[PDB]
């Protein structure tokens, strides 16, 4: 869980970030609230334009799924009723997969969730709470649950998991499970053991994120 992030790296965007876990590096940018296109307009709430760009080649249907899952996480996080008939552009440029993209998209999704959240924080957009996402995997010979697995570990995995939780009260109370994307062969006992260990490492991540956010933003503010 030795992640590293930077905040406010882009000039022509309201907010930006660069999240790095292992070899997975994703840069994200957020502009909003701004004027929306007519087809995007929502009478009462904020409209989200979510874009995911791959590390190699052009955006395909694969990234279209990454956009969809990332939408399921960011939508309830943002206090959308504060910005009626308005738009918020959220762009993720995956710079380095950190995994075999022909087989997995686990680490890229988690890194996009964490980066998007950080970019939303930087942009100063109304959020109902905080959030953290981690990738998890299981190995058949080992029987182990490995949090933040490497690319080599994924190759020999039986199941891959993306867990993103919603935290409140100083990152101590799990408000809800924003996203759990479990793929592969697994049983009910493995699922809850995954959720128990997953919640712990997620809570540790929020604490680390809270540290990063305060370290970067506080110099900008005044005492």
């Amino acid at each position: 869980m030795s992640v590293q992030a930077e905040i406010g790296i882009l000039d022509h965007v309201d907010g930006s970030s660069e999240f790095v876990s292992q070899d997975t590096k994703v840069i994200c940018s957020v502009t909003g609230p701004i004027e929306p296109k007519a087809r995007q307009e929502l009478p009462t709430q904020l409209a989200l334009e979510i874009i995911v760009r791959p590390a190699k080649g052009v955006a395909t249907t694969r990234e279209k799924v990454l956009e969809d899952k990332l939408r399921a996480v960011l939508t309830p996080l943002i206090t959308r009723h504060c910005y009626p008939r308005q738009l918020c552009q959220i762009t993720c440029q995956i710079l380095e997969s950190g995994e075999d993209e022909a087989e997995f998209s686990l680490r890229e999704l988690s890194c996009c969730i964490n980066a998007a959240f950080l970019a939303l924080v930087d942009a100063g957009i109304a959020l109902n709470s905080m959030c953290a996402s981690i990738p998890i995997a299981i190995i058949k010979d080992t029987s182990d649950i490995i949090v933040d697995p490497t690319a080599e570990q994924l190759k020999i995995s039986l199941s891959v998991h993306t867990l993103a939780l919603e935290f409140v009260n100083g990152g101590k109370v799990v408000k809800n499970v924003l996203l759990l994307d479990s793929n592969g062969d697994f049983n009910e006992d493995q699922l809850f053991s995954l959720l128990e260990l997953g919640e712990q490492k997620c809570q540790e991540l929020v604490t680390n994120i809270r540290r990063i956010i305060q370290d970067n933003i506080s110099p900008r503010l005044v005492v």
Binding site: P33, T44, G124, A126, N128, V168, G171, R210, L221
Partner: protein, 237 residues
């Protein structure tokens, strides 16, 4: 050092105390609970302020959101019957400036402004689900208006925090450091726009370069010394 807060954290103040909610603080229409939605430093006004305490969160932002009683710098971009279409900030929703509200206003009388002009304007009304309205003369102004066209000069992009500090904080040395070198006028907008003019372009340019450098570093100490190197470089020719 300050007491930082994050969205979804517990709100310190007790419901038994009447609290006026400012920026960053949100009152849920469904559960009636008061909760912070922005990330930054929580500021709570001292008690005794007419029995009402004002609590808000100072958070970093650069995308302006129109609020009533704000002095802003807009650019005319449009013509509509009964008003000007003015843009506070790029890609943001346009604001309206009625033909009615001007310094020596008349319904018959009309403004001479031409699309592309900078206006020092006050935002009297900012409905959340409706286009922003900007007025050059305000009833609050009560017969005194600083509102109107800005001629020539140079405009500068600046984050909302830096602009707010430049407008409301008198301890901000930026104006002073620029006064000990040359004399010029400045318009300050809460929408993150700063208008600077001098008699000579080289001085306005020097001011432009200083404000950006000081906005970038955000180190209060640097500017007087930072300004000194900037003034010198212009004469380098």
């Amino acid at each position: 050092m300050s007491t930082f807060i994050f969205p979804g954290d517990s709100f310190p103040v007790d419901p038994t105390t009447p609290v006026k909610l400012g920026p960053g603080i949100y009152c849920d229409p469904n559960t009636q609970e008061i909760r912070p939605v922005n990330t930054g430093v929580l500021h709570v006004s001292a008690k005794g302020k007419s029995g009402v305490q004002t609590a808000y969160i100072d958070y970093s932002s650069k995308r302006y959101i129109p609020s009533v009683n704000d002095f802003v710098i807009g650019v005319i971009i449009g013509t509509f019957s009964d008003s000007y279409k003015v843009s506070l900030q790029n890609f943001s929703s346009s604001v309206s400036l009625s033909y009615m509200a001007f310094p020596n206003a008349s319904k018959k009388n009309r403004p001479t402004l031409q699309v592309g002009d900078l206006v020092y304007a006050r935002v009297c009304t900012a409905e959340k689900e409706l286009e922003a309205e900007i007025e050059c003369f305000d009833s609050t102004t009560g017969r005194d208006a600083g509102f109107g066209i800005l001629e020539d000069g140079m405009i500068i992009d600046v984050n909302l925090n830096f602009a707010r500090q430049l407008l409301f904080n008198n301890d901000f040395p930026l104006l002073k450091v620029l006064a000990a070198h040359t004399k010029f006028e400045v318009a300050i907008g809460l929408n993150g726009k700063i208008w600077v003019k001098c008699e000579e372009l080289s001085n306005t340019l020097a001011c432009y370069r200083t404000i950006m450098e000081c906005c970038q570093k955000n180190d209060t100490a640097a500017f007087k010394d930072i300004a000194k190197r900037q003034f010198k470089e212009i004469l380098t020719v």
